[PDB]
Amino acid sequence: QLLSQANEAFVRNDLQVAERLFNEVIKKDARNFAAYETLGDIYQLQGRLNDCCNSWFLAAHLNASDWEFWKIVAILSADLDHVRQAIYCFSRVISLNPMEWESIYRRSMLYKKTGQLARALDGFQRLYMYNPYDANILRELAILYVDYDRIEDSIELYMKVFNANVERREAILAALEINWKKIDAKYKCIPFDWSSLNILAELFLKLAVSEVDGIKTIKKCARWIQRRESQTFWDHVPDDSEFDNRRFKNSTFDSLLAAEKEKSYNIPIDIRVRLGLLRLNTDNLVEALNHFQCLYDETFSDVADLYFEAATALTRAEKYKEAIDFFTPLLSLEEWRTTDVFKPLARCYKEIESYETAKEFYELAIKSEPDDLDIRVSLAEVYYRLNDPETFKHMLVDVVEMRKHQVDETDAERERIERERRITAKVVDKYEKMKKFENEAKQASIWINTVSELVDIFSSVKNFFMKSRSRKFVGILRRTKKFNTELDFQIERLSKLAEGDSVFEGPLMEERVTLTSATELRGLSYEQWFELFMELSLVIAKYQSVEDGLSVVETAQEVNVFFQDPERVKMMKFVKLAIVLQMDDEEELAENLRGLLNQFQFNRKVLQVFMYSLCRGPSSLNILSSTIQQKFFLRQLKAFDSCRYNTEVNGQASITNKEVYNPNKKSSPYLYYIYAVLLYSSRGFLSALQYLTRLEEDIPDDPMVNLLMGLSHIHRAMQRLTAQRHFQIFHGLRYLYRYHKIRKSLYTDLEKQEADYNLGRAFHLIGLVSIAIEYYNRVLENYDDGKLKKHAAYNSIIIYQQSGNVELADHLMEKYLSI
Amino acid sequence: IADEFTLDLPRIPSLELPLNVSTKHSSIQKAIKMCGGIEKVKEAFKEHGPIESQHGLQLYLNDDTDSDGSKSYFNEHPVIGKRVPFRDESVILKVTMPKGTLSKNNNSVKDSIKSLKDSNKLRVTPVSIVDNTIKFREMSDFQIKLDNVPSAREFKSSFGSLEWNNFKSFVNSVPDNDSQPQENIGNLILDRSVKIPSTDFQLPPPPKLSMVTYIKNYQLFVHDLSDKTVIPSQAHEQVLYDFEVAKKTKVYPGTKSDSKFYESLEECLKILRELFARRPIWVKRHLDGIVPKKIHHTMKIALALISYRFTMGPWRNTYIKFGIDPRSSVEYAQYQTEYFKIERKLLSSPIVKKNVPKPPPLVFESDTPGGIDSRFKFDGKRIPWYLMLQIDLLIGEPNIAEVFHNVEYLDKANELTGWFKELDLVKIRRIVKYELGCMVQGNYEYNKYKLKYFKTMLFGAITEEPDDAALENEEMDTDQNLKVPAXXXXXXXXXXXXXXXXXXXXXX
Amino acid sequence: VNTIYIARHGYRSNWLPEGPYPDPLTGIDSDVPLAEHGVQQAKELAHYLLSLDNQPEAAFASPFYRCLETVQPIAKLLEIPVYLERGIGEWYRPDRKPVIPVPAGYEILSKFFPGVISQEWDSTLTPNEKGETEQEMYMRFKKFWPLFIERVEKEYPNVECILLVTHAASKIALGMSLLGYDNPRMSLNENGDKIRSGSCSLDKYEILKTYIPFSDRKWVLTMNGNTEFLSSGEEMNWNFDCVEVETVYISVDIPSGNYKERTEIAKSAILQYSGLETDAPLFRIGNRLYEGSWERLVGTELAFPNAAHVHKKTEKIYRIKERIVLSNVR
């Protein structure tokens, strides 16, 4: 071609003015990248960048192996906000080499800008896998898992950094016997500092289900920093004694070196406040404040976004007194003086019965957004709580007309005796209509309705609660379903608040009224009301949601007539326990049991409620196996010995019952038994025998003592590593063979079946499997009750799978474990 | 080779039951009901972390409700099934065939496909992938029947049924102050229908019961420190018989003549007789530093015909010469026992496991010739090797001395706190808890104001339970068997025990 | 563009037994909306796609009102654009008695579907307003693919997977034309197995293993009308000839012979089976080849497809009693 002569005659460039002739060669040949490169190159010199990237894009497809050229035109395109054209150019690079880690970063960052994050995330796992030790890849990879709500996988991304930072420091301190080049080649990691701990705190809040286990992880990362990883004992104290001035009052911190005390015990406030938000979702107000009271020492303007994020949490958690302390300082600043401070602040002053102070903060919020009526209806409510109905009616016409404009486009003494008269007739007849009558699940819902229509008359009196009723509890009373919307409900409610009265939920929304008598509020008499709360709590727990009945009893514990009187606070502690059994959560059951055992000391009915409540499951094993319970009953078990043995003046400071009567000074076989279960459940088979053997001296013909004794030896034997192991299993079987001889002989023919199973189950434990099936074939063949047969066929099947006798494991499963 | 199918599919969980669930939708929902319900099956797949940071499902094989709403057999001790880690992903295929082909072909898919080999109606398509499974590899636990226990009948009908009509009768029945904790609970119950035996005591079960060349010794033990109890003053009927013949024929029946057990015994026996004359109360762990290695095996037999040991009281687990009742004189007050424990579970640090010195050997040589070491003794430094230690050893510490040298002794021995008041003993115990907790951390400085408040008191890291090093040495002392050197029938014959083999034969 | 999904609109209202009470909201003839059951289908197609890996990245619906209702929740859930494409409208024979309807544009449908629809995409081709016979239909779908993809691969070079929400007659011609058959009413391979075009079905066309122009590419069908995500199965299938059965599940395990390391599937794999009749079937899974052995399991294995791992940019249980254990032969 002659153009091969003409073009490089024009590549004598030297002033870049012959570009018109290059424009001809790309028209004549239209295949030489040399023409498009230079025509694009000279555009870079004149500065016509949008014309440069075009020519290099046409040029790239002609010689598509030079992955250095796709990149230099790709990055140019991203600079000129042509992202879709850039992602292609990067994608051509990665096909030519999948081991270029700058383009995967620049490409994946553009996927985010485009909205197809799934291809971005795929780029970062590999970019993180082949370079785990760069923070920028870590920081952007953890944003994307958060965009998928994969937060638990983002925490294990920052935590596997921490677990590498730890093993580095342990190797440094051990390798002092220095070679930086030898530890860096083996232990290389991203530095963990206060910043990465700050992000890590944000994730536990967004996760919002592992509150207490996440606090302990923040504190381990806070004591590792500051060089205090050796103070492991803070992992076991409950409530944030470290990082506060309460650490001086600890038995162990007072014992440390004189040099370990001066290390730093101060968190930056951006992390401390997050801990208070963890404790608040845990429903631990006290430690939340102890974190937020540290927010007052910092300079005001530097933490104003934390005054708000703390108060906003306390306001959403119904803590209306504590939140005002954190909103009101912000009013010193003008940039915070808008509705998002006022409207959460004004309802706080409303629930605290400071109405004349809240009248302003509503009247200020409307000036910013008059088009809102959440404020107008509440600010109308305040004019009724104040004795000024004249302005109240003029605010009702303003709001309802304001709503009708929006849906189209889409005698003070005589006032209440006349109400008390008709409300007492309503509550007494509705109660008599509830007694003469009552499927057993539709008779409940019709019953719960005509009782929730009574409990709304008692709880709405406001002389009984030092706080407002929970939204969780009014939600159980708003379940009558006649409402349309939570704000519409107020309007059809407030419209009748004017002068008249009629049937509607929330009678007058609340009101303090003169009680004028004890033993009567309405025609009911304070022992007909308490029987409703307790009977309403259980029925809702049995047929309806269990978590709703628990709100009825937690609300009955704060009525100022019930907990003031004993013999009512007793029942609410039991009724609340009966429901907590059905929550299936560990760490409030224990809070209820320890609440009973402190009141009811040495009582035998409660110690059985303790262990019948804990009769199955790992949620119950973790309670008994806990050290907190092992310290408690030991404290009650030394107190029992003090009551019987001391001839001294000291029988106080733990003794709550002064009525114990034991002239022969016998022990209690229950406290020895409950306490041995804790040590058995803690794999403490030596300590348990120290207490169970004291029972075998006292109650030898009790089966459950001879069973635990037989298992405490069998289990202890398999710990030992000497020839006394064999003598200790034979010493266990003798207590199992008399367990057998007892249940077989002295009980009926259902416990006679138990004893065969638990013996066969013992020979499986010690591996004498050929004997185990012999006892299992007795519970299947020689007895009629079939509830233990499917536990025996379960364990026989396992024997046969291991022995390959699947021919017979199919026969048992089809007969007993069928369904 | 054939038609294609994509495998970018839902990655779903599975649940490999050990049960023969049928195809019916009533049969499946019952098997979900056993495992807690469909809402609790799903949160078992959505849980991460190592074991017991995740607890799996609870297969209740006998899940059914009585008429009162209570769980029939409310103590079932379920089978726990946990997520298998590192599962090999498996595809599942929807095999589709005409209605009625399973019934005529043994209800098997292996053969059904073989019957209609060339039909156009067989459609076989993958529908999902299984990346996660729960399966039940563990085994069922020991089971207890509480149907005729009347307290469980009262619990089950109140806390299980949540019926308020009989809940109220329960709570009004618990006495706010119980006057007889020491007695059986058959008196507080008002059912009286089932007639529990009088010696059952209604002890409820725990939540997890499954948690995975010789001589017989005859030492005496004293089980109760009542004002009535008798103390041994003569050894034992059998040991004296085994030992009196050992004097004439020098074999000590139960041994070979070549073991020299008896010649080792006398050379140990004359040692102890000198010691108990010098110090009548002892711990065996102090005697290990005195008797040589060659005659230590026979010491556990010489103590039996020289000494007894209480199983409780102030003189708990010490060997005491015969005829010596420590409640008879106050001079046996400095020998009474005190225990201490270091909680590794709370002090889980490297600072601790170097400062706590390692235990003794089974037998050693005493740095103090012919006596207790300075390493069992507590003197404000050097945590002793063995933390059960008598009052006679603490007094080397100055602050515990001037407490000890100002005590007022009781006129009559208390069954706990001994001759000492409760005050003057916690005054001793709390100092030692403070000093050990400090020297574990390596402090050794001892602030004087806290250490002075105790001495003038009038009225946790370290704890006073018996240490595991002690309990492991108590069992080796209470074991009635010792070494002398310095398949239903086969298993029944292999044991050959005097009791274990007796009852084992009766039950077969 | 390496991957394509195609899906049918859903359950119309006129298919109700009580009859067609609703009116076309747009005013065009036969532009009928969906029933409430057809809306529950389209949500179930969203939660299914949302459980996949190669989720679609753009949606090309037909202008008819019911195809927009189908893709509306798919757009909200996956957060993708929705473009109108008139070239995938219905096939109307010229003998329609009342009228041959032409559907609405953007300005009418944006009022009912605010924000969802994106108006960047002008239609590449318009069906004949007079109506078109069957031979004219299929050549129209021969023209559609080269012109459509080439306008996707230059206005959106980054999009590699797409969804098309269309009708039955189109859905079966879009498939055959893509796979390269001569007329649409023939069977795929030889066995009378047409494309299953049930209500709210889902097809899948992956490219058969530098970048090359469209017409030189080779595609394969890898789903052929999945309706398992539906709570009611395929309702109203249609094929060009229109102008008892039981299901059981079996697992296919792939066990490793190593300590605590798990096999995996690449989320883009392909499966072929053969010898399923006999005792030793052979499966290919991706590039690797296996040989199986039937093994019933004691007990059962219950799988929960409603418990699937949804990704999401912020009732039915499978009773298994038999199993196949695969071993490496490659």
Author numbering:
A (entry chain A): 130 to 306, 341 to 573, 612 to 639, 645 to 1025
B (entry chain B): 25 to 236, 263 to 509, 566 to 592, 1006 to 1027
C (entry chain C): 3 to 211, 227 to 260, 290 to 360, 418 to 433
Sentences from the paper on this structure:
In yeast, transcription of all Pol III genes minimally requires two conserved transcription factors (TFs) to initiate transcription in vivo, namely TFIIIC and TFIIIB. cerevisiae TFIIIC consists of six subunits with a combined molecular weight of 520 kDa, and binds to promoter elements termed A-box and B-box that are downstream of the transcription start site (TSS). The six subunits of TFIIIC are organized in two subcomplexes: τA comprises subunit τ131, τ95, and τ55, and τB comprises subunits τ138, τ91, and τ60. τA binds the A-box with low affinity and is responsible for TFIIIB recruitment. τB binds the B-box with high affinity, and the quality of the B-box determines promoter strength.
We report a 3.1 Å cryo-electron microscopy (cryo-EM) structure of τA, which constitutes the most conserved part of TFIIIC. However, TFIIIB and DNA had dissociated from τA during sample preparation and are not visible in the EM density. The cryo-EM map allowed us to build an atomic model of τA with excellent refinement statistics, but also revealed density for two molecules of the detergent CHAPSO, which was added before plunge-freezing to prevent adsorption to the air–water interface, bound to τA. Interestingly, our cryo-EM map reveals a molecule of the detergent CHAPSO bound to the right arm of τ131, which is also predicted to bind TFIIIB, and it is therefore possible that addition of CHAPSO competed with TFIIIB for binding to τ131 and thereby contributed to dissociation of TFIIIB from τA. The convex surface of the N-terminal τ131 TPR array binds the τ55 HPD and the triple β-barrel formed by the τ55–τ95 dimerization domains. Despite only being present in hemiascomycetes and being absent in other eukaryotes, the τ55 HPD is well-ordered and an integral part of the τA structure, rather than being flexibly attached to the τA core. Our structure shows that the τ55 active site is accessible in τA, arguing that TFIIIC can directly modify substrates and the activity might be coupled to its function as a TF. The acidic plug contains a helix that is rich in negatively charged residues and is embedded in the positively charged DBD.
